[PDB]
Design a protein around this ligand. Structure first.
Ligand code: HEM
Length: 153
């Protein structure tokens, strides 16, 4: 768990995202897809995109970036009491989509990257530690549900 102080940092940093949800959302999705092309194959919707220029020009990709980050902001505001929120995603990814926990590791890292890229010098050592921990808690609670459901890999 995180202390109240670490949660305060997480929600302060999130304010940065809330000022431009689509821009951050889009950058996150591009960093995942170019760094790990295998991830793109889980989206029938975007598998056509080949070049980063195409990704950048896709309005639909921006839309999907908004949907993802809005869902994450909701979960983070619960300060760890997010069991109702996580259930649909975990059940969905463990049975229908078959999303390895590794992909969640990948997008967590992509979020950290984007925050440093868009706010250089404004995302401190303490803020990075608190944001890293919050994304780990999210991943670990999903990992618990994956074990229950036998989503092995
Ligand atoms: C920060 C973590 C993530 C959050 C909060 C999140 C959230 C969401 C939301 C809110 C939806 C829309 C639900 C719906 O269509 O009913 C969605 C759909 C989806 N997400 Fe996740 N997601 C995340 C990570 C990922 C990752 C890493 C992948 C990688 C393969 C992924 C793959 C998908 C797919 C394939 C869909 C369905 C899209 C479609 O059928 O059009 N998600 N996600």
């Amino acid at each position: 768990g995180l202390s109240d102080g670490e949660w305060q940092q997480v929600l302060n940093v999130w304010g940065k995202v809330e000022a431009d949800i689509a821009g951050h959302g889009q950058e996150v999705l591009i960093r995942l897809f170019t760094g790990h092309p295998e991830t793109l194959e889980k989206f029938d919707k975007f598998k056509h995109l080949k070049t980063e220029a195409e990704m950048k020009a896709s309005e639909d990709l921006k839309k999907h970036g908004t949907v993802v980050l809005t869902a994450l902001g909701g979960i983070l505001k619960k300060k760890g009491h997010h069991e109702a929120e996580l259930k649909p995603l975990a059940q969905s990814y463990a049975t229908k989509h078959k999303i390895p926990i590794k992909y969640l590791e990948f997008i967590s890292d992509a979020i950290i990257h984007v925050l440093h890229s868009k706010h250089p010098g404004d995302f401190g050592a303490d803020a990075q530690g608190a944001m890293t921990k919050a994304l780990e808690l999210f991943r670990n609670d999903i990992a618990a549900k994956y074990k229950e459901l036998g989503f092995q890999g």
